[PDB]
Amino acid sequence: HMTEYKLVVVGAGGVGKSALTIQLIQNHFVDEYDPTIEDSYRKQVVIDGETCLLDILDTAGQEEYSAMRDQYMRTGEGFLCVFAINNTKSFEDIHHYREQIKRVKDSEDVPMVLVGNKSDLPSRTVDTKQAQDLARSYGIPFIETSAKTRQGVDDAFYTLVREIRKHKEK
Ligand SMILES: Nc1nc2c(ncn2[C@@H]2O[C@H](COP(=O)(O)OP(=O)(O)O)[C@@H](O)[C@H]2O)c(=O)[nH]1
Ligand SMILES: [Mg+2]
């Protein structure tokens, strides 16, 4: 009656991991969300005729990974690797998040989507072609999002579900 899909949202502080997740669940842009709140959220949604229950960890910070975060990294089926298109450092940081996932999974073939968030903002410092070059090298999709306008948000999450299905029987 429902298929569970366990998703993890990672990336530098301030890129919009929480805003993206909240925009997915609540259809609202939250302007100011606690940067330290790490928690799991659930969403029921029909994707390609399948009733899915998304179990989504929105990660926050470093320093003594909770039991929960360690659990989700280990048992997570797919990862959204988020940077902001007006945050060059966040883009450069993606390498470290991908290295972490590769280590936790002992594999280069983990379901993953590269997300360039804050597409609504005029201060773009990361070109779509840069992002495309990075995702091409990793062998993953790249999608641009705005948690403010909702552009691409469903698309990122649905695409990650689809990547998981490409990798394993669900
Ligand atoms: N304009 C714009 N602001 C955003 C977007 N996503 C997040 N923000 C803002 O960016 C800041 C960081 O967002 P947050 O979701 O807390 O980042 P996190 O640390 O990655 O969870 C907040 O002030 C949000 O209001 C976006 O798509 N567009
Ligand atoms: Mg957050």
CATH of the domain at 66: 3.40.50.300
Would residue 118 be called left, alpha or beta, if left means φ above 0 and alpha means ψ between -120 and 50 degrees?
left
Experimental method: X-ray
Count of CB atoms situated within 10 Å of the CB of 102: 15
Provide the domain count of the chain: 1
- Give the number of the atom of ligand 1 that is nearest the alpha carbon of residue 58: 21
Residues with CB under 6 A from ligand 1: 13-19, 31-33, 35, 117-118, 120-121, 146-148
Query: Which structural domain range is residue 159 located in?
Result: 1-170
Q: What is the resolution of this structure in A?
A: 1.8
User: Ligand 1 atom 2: the closest Cα is on which residue?
Assistant: 118
Report d(CA 110, CA 128) in Å as an integer: 23
